[PDB]
C-alpha cells in the first residue's frame, strides 16, 4: 500500500456559479449594503433599477385588458415581454396588479459568496455590466496538486483522506473525486478535484488542505524494511532456518513504502 501526501486548495464550487446581469438597460435606484467578499443567501436583494424598455408593451397589454381583448391576443403580448427579457415573476406581478412595472429588484439567485460587484449607487446599468458574481461553497471544492512524474500513484481504487490545518476539530467527508484530464502547465502537476461536504461552512476557499492518498499495488512478497540489506549491487535478507541457523538469501526488490 503506497502512501504519499499532496498539498491542496479549498476553492469555490464552480458548478454553483452565478453572474447576475440586467436583462435590459436602465439606471440604479438603490444598492443594498453589499460588497465583494460578502456572503449572500438566495433571495438577498442586490439592487433596485429602473427599466423603461418594457413599459410600451406592458401598457399595450393593460389596455387590451380594458378593451376585453382575446386570451390569444393578451397572451401574445406577454410572450413578447418574456422574449424581451422581462423576468417571469415580474410579469406575474404585472398580471396580478394590472400595474405597469417600472422599478425592479435583482436578487441573488443562489447561496454563496460575492466575488464581483461592479455597480454602486448613482450609476447607469448596462446589459454587459455584472451586478454580482456569486460563487457557492457548500459542496466545497478541494483541488490537490500531484507532480506529473508520480501520476501512476493515483488509481481508481485509491483511498483518499482530507485534513485542513485551520480546523483540526473537523473530519471531512469526500463526496466524490476526479482526476482532471490535463496537467497544469505552470506547475507541471495533475489536478485532482475533490467535492467535500461543507454545510457548516468551516472550509473557507483559499484555505490550505493536505490530501493523503493510499494506493494498493499488485500482490508481492512483503517484508519489513529493516529486514532488507542493499549494497547497491545486490539485495539480501537473513533467513532463519528450522534449527535456528541464520542463512542469507538473495532477493529482488520491487518497491517499498511506509
Amino acid at each position: 500500500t503506497f502512501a504519499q501526501s499532496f498539498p491542496a486548495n479549498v476553492s469555490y464550487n464552480e458548478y454553483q456559479y452565478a453572474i447576475v446581469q440586467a436583462r435590459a438597460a436602465g439606471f440604479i435606484d438603490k444598492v443594498y449594503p453589499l460588497t465583494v467578499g460578502d456572503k449572500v443567501q438566495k433571495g438577498t436583494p442586490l439592487l433596485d433599477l429602473t427599466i423603461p424598455d418594457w413599459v410600451e408593451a406592458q401598457s399595450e397589454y393593460l389596455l387590451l385588458r380594458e378593451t376585453g381583448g382575446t386570451a390569444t391576443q393578451t397572451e401574445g403580448i406577454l410572450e413578447r415581454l418574456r422574449l424581451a427579457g422581462m423576468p417571469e415573476a415580474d410579469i406575474r406581478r404585472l398580471i396580478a396588479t394590472q400595474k405597469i412595472q417600472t422599478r425592479f429588484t435583482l436578487k441573488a439567485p443562489i447561496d454563496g459568496v460575492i466575488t464581483a460587484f461592479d455597480l454602486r449607487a448613482g450609476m447607469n446599468i448596462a446589459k454587459d455590466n455584472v451586478v454580482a458574481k456569486i460563487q457557492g461553497m457548500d459542496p466545497v471544492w478541494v483541488t490537490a496538486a500531484i507532480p506529473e512524474s508520480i501520476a501512476w500513484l493515483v488509481k481508481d481504487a485509491s483511498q483518499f483522506t482530507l485534513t485542513v490545518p485551520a480546523r483540526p476539530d473537523k473530519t471531512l467527508t469526500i463526496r466524490k473525486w476526479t482526476l482532471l484530464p490535463g496537467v497544469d502547465a505552470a506547475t507541471r502537476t495533475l489536478q485532482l478535484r475533490l467535492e467535500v461536504d461543507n454545510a457548516d461552512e468551516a472550509l473557507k476557499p483559499g484555505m490550505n488542505a493536505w490530501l493523503q492518498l493510499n494506493t494498493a499495488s499488485e500482490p508481492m512478497l512483503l517484508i519489513p524494511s529493516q529486514a532488507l540489506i542493499d549494497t547497491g549491487s545486490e539485495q539480501r535478507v537473513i533467513t532463519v532456518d528450522a534449527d535456528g541457523r541464520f542463512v542469507p538469501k538473495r532477493v529482488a526488490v520491487f518497491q517499498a513504502s511506509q
Partner: protein
C-alpha cells in the same frame, strides 16, 4: 507549505541568515556623556524564530517562518555516545593533561 505559500527552501535559508545579529550605531553625545547605540536582533526565543519574515504583501500582511515550518528544540547529531553501568545514556567529561606534565 512551501508550495502553498510560494516560498522556496532557499528563501527560507536567506531569511534565517538575516534574523540573528546585533548592530552598533556608534555613540551619541547627551549631557556630555557617551551613549552607545545598540541594536538588538539576536534569536533567543522560539517565537523569534517563528517571526522570521519570509514575504510581505503590499497590504502589510506578512508570511512568517511559522507558516511553512515548525520550530522545535531537538538534539543535534551525536558524534559520540556515553553509557554508564549499562543502565543509561549520560553526559561525561574527560580531563586531558599536557604531554609531559
Amino acid at each position: 507549505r512551501l508550495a502553498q505559500y510560494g516560498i522556496s527552501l532557499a528563501e527560507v535559508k536567506s531569511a534565517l541568515d538575516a534574523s540573528n545579529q546585533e548592530a552598533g550605531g556608534s555613540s551619541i553625545e547627551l549631557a556630555e556623556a557617551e551613549y552607545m547605540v545598540r541594536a538588538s536582533g539576536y534569536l533567543q526565543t522560539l517565537d523569534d524564530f517563528n517571526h522570521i519574515v519570509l514575504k510581505a504583501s503590499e497590504n502589510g500582511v506578512p508570511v512568517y517562518l511559522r507558516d511553512v515550518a515548525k520550530v522545535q528544540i531537538g538534539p543535534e547529531m551525536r558524534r559520540g555516545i556515553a553509557e554508564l553501568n549499562g543502565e543509561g545514556e549520560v553526559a561525561g567529561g574527560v580531563v586531558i593533561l599536557r604531554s609531559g606534565k
